[PDB]
Amino acid sequence: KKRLTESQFQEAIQGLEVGQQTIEIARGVLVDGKPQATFATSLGLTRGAVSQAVHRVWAAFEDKNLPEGYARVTAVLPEHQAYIVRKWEADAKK
Amino acid sequence: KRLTESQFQEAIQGLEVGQQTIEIARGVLVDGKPQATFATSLGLTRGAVSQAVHRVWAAFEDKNLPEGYARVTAVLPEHQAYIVRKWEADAKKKQ
DNA sequence: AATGTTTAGCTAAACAAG
DNA sequence: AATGTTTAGCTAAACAAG
Numbered sequence: 375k376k377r378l379t380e381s382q383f384q385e386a387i388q389g390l391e392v393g394q395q396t397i398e399i400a401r402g403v404l405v406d407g408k409p410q411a412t413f414a415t416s417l418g419l420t421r422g423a424v425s426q427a428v429h430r431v432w433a434a435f436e437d438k439n440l441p442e443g444y445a446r447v448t449a450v451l452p453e454h455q456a457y458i459v460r461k462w463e464a465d466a467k468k
Numbered sequence: 469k470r471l472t473e474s475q476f477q478e479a480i481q482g483l484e485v486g487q488q489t490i491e492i493a494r495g496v497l498v499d500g501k502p503q504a505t506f507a508t509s510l511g512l513t514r515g516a517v518s519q520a521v522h523r524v525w526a527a528f529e530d531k532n533l534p535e536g537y538a539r540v541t542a543v544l545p546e547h548q549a550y551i552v553r554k555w556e557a558d559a560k561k562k563q
Numbered sequence: 564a565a566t567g568t569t570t571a572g573c574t575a576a577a578c579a580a581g
Numbered sequence: 582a583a584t585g586t587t588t589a590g591c592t593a594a595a596c597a598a599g
Binding site: 440444445446448449450452459460462 | 533536537540541542544545546548549553555556559
Binding site: 391392393395396419420422423426427430 | 570571572573574575576
């Protein structure tokens with residue numbers, strides 16, 4: 375169970391193109407710790423829809439909290455360079 | 469954007485794709501038909517037909533990269549992101 | 564007018580976790 | 582059994598270009 379403080383939630387949704395329903399679901403789950411099931415029930419949504427709603431806000435938070443100084447990069451690379459990049463990632467993981 | 473039937477089959481190889489999307493994508497990319505023809509015939513929105521074409525085109529773009537090349541995404545220290553950006557230019561210059 | 568695009572958001576239903 | 586995740590495929594409706 376991923377959780378956010380209100381401060382972290384405010385950061386997550388600042389500038390985010392997100393509707394009121396998604397905000398309410400995400401706050402209830404991530405900030406208040408309520409089950410996603412409660413919103414699926416009350417809003418007449420599939421479990422997958424509620425899962426995606428929480429994920430949209432979580433993903434936004436993650437994008438604003440990358441390690442200090444780090445950049446996301448995407449590139450088409452030859453085999454040996456692609457290997458090096460994946461190994462930088464793998465070694466950073468563990 | 470246009471494809472031969474061979475390129476089209478390459479595009480969809482290993483792709484999870486249903487026949488309706490295959491029909492739309494072939495019609496547009498291979499046979500050169502407007503997307504509009506499929507929105508009408510299949511009762512779909514324009515955006516659905518546009519996405520259908522996109523799903524197969526994107527798959528083709530990945531298959532059609534040079535042998536041994538791959539699209540990688542990573543979150544890295546700035547200096548390593550810099551190295552990757554340079555490599556990306558080196559690869560473009562070679563191709 | 565006509566045609567094609569973008570993306571937040573949702574479905575279906577298999578799947579993964581609890 | 583209940584609950585949460587994934588993703589090709591869909592719409593909505595606003596935007597892009599002619």
